[PDB]
Design a protein around this ligand. Structure first.
Ligand SMILES: CS(=O)(=O)Nc1ccc2c(c1)OCCO2
Lengths: 237, 300
């Protein structure tokens, strides 16, 4: 059934599973027309499909051409997401296919179930966890590849860089969601924390800076403070 | 007119014949039901006074044989049987009518209710849903499960309704996943009508039979089937105009007949609100929407 804090430890077992987040698939800017009506302009989006044990991120870039001449785009976006996840599973060798797919939003359940009817043994599950994957487009290198795309494209990343050499995936996921949640709460501040120090750089083949173990503890504390800070600014506490 | 005689009535029981019912006392001088309209299927049904558990009954068509009821003290129920000796049977019925030991099927002449509830119901199709080929009549009770319920246990005692499943490979064409899930016209028209039922008359017959089993026996799997067959039509954008008009009439008479006090358990709030107020056919069921809004406005 649904994942939540009474059984989140199943994410780090050896059954292959993927999270699917669709919150950045259909993206728009809203603006005024010459006549003073309102219109939308779509911009490129992405499906965020992540293996939480390995860090492998299947970023399917959604080019605005896919919306041309279509109606009810917010509804189409869920079915297009399900179509692309289904196509991804079919492209993987059988021993790499997930045994479970966890959708971050319950409106993806039926679209994905219908597209995966050919895979009755793959469990499609919702989650009570409020995961911050909408903030993926705050990672500069991911945002860059989405906005530069001129056609549909899949790009593979490891969202944990090399962290698993030193920490467990339970810890790597803890750090990842804490970073994404901080980017979601106050993007400017979070990015200043991550990049204020010019001596720590991001390797060409990485997404995040090359922090020592001790530096990560400092960064993690600063992100905890930021999330607490914004909570007080928001609620006047 | 036809007659279903009773050998006797040894246990107190409420007896139904179609939409009518009456109480018989233990060992009362009751010897059956006369004046049954020829031309329609019928259902004769039972609820024991001492154990309302298990409503049960028999679907039959008087044109297919001479049928009677006899209590079986070993299996503890009223059983339908066929008498093949035509002369023995005529003799028995005449003696019981002469002595006036029978209730008369009480059809009002203005009244088309039973026809309207059974218009498309055929005994040959009932017998394929209820498999017991050595008898010309078909036994149904409150507890019998459907073939679909058995997939989610005795196969001999099951209701073999046509399986409808909106998230199934049969319902969804590869490459039209969104289209076929949000508009079920493919599943209704090609898969079900052309493919399985062959025509809308057979589809309506199964729909009507499912409702009647839900109403008369409280059969839960039958109520699920009735609602599935309604939902498949209402969730299709493309339905023949004559089917919509007939569906509206069918449902109208079904809602009209339903006991007011059983509406809570026989009607699925989600399906009806979807069908009358959200679906493609939300504006196509005028008679049904009017009787539902005036009779069961709570559900909506
Ligand atoms: C997604 S969240 O923002 O609620 N943070 C979260 C979730 C699951 C975890 C976790 C952190 O640490 C590792 C164990 O599993």
């Amino acid at each position: 059934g649904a994942m939540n804090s009474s059984n989140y430890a199943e994410l780090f077992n050896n059954d292959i599973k993927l999270f699917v987040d669709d919150t950045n698939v259909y993206r728009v800017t809203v603006h005024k027309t010459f006549e003073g009506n309102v219109a939308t302009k779509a911009i490129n989006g992405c499906i965020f499909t992540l293996n939480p044990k390995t860090g492998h991120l299947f970023l399917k870039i959604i080019h605005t051409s896919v919306w041309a001449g279509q109606k009810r785009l917010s509804q189409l976006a869920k079915w297009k997401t399900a179509e692309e996840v289904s196509a991804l599973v079919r492209s993987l060798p059988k021993e790499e296919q997930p045994k479970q797919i966890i959708v971050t939003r319950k409106a993806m359940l039926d679209p994905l179930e219908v597209h995966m009817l050919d895979f009755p043994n793959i469990a499609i599950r919702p989650t009570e966890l409020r995961l911050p994957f909408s903030a993926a487009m705050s990672i500069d290198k991911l945002s860059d590849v989405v906005m530069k795309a001129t056609e549909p494209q899949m790009v593979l990343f490891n969202i944990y860089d090399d962290w698993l050499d030193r920490i467990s995936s339970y810890t790597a996921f803890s750090r990842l969601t804490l970073l994404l949640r901080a980017l979601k709460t106050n993007e400017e501040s979070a990015k200043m924390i991550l990049l204020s120090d010019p001596t720590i750089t991001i390797k060409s083949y990485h997404l995040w800076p090359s922090f020592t173990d001790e530096q990560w503890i400092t960064i993690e504390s600063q992100m905890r403070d930021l999330i607490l800070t914004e909570y007080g600014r928001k609620y006047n506490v | 007119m036809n007659t279903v005689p009773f050998t006797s009535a040894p246990i107190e029981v409420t007896i139904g014949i179609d939409q009518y019912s009456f109480n018989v006392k233990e060992n009362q001088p009751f010897h059956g039901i006369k004046d049954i309209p020829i031309g329609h299927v019928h259902v004769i049904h039972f609820q024991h006074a001492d154990n309302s558990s298990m409503r049960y009954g028999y679907w039959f068509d008087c044109r297919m044989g001479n049928f009677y009821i006899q209590y079986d003290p070993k299996d503890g129920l009223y059983k339908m049987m066929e008498e093949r000796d035509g002369a023995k049977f005529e003799n028995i019925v005449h003696n019981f009518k002469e002595r006036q030991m029978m209730v008369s099927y009480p059809k009002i002449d203005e009244d088309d209710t039973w026809y309207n509830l059974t218009e498309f119901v055929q005994m040959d199709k009932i017998r394929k849903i209820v498999r017991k080929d050595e008898n010309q009549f078909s036994y149904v009770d409150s507890s019998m499960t459907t073939v679909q319920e058995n997939e989610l246990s005795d196969p001999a005692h099951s209701l073999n309704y046509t399986v409808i499943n909106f998230k199934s490979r049969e319902a969804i064409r590869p490459g039209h996943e969104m289209e076929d899930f949000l508009d079920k016209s493919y599943y209704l028209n090609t898969v079900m009508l052309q493919g399985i039922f062959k025509n809308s008359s057979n589809y309506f017959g199964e729909l009507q039979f499912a409702f009647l089993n839900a109403m008369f026996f409280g059969n839960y799997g039958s109520s699920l089937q009735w609602h599935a067959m309604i939902e498949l039509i209402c969730s299709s954008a493309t339905v023949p105009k004559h089917m919509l008009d007939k569906l509206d009439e069918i449902l109208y008479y079904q809602i009209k007949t339903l006991p007011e006090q059983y509406s809570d358990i026989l009607l699925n709030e989600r399906v009806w609100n979807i069908c009358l107020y959200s679906s493609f056919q939300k504006n196509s069921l005028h008679n049904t929407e009017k009787i539902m809004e005036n009779k069961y406005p709570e559900l909506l």
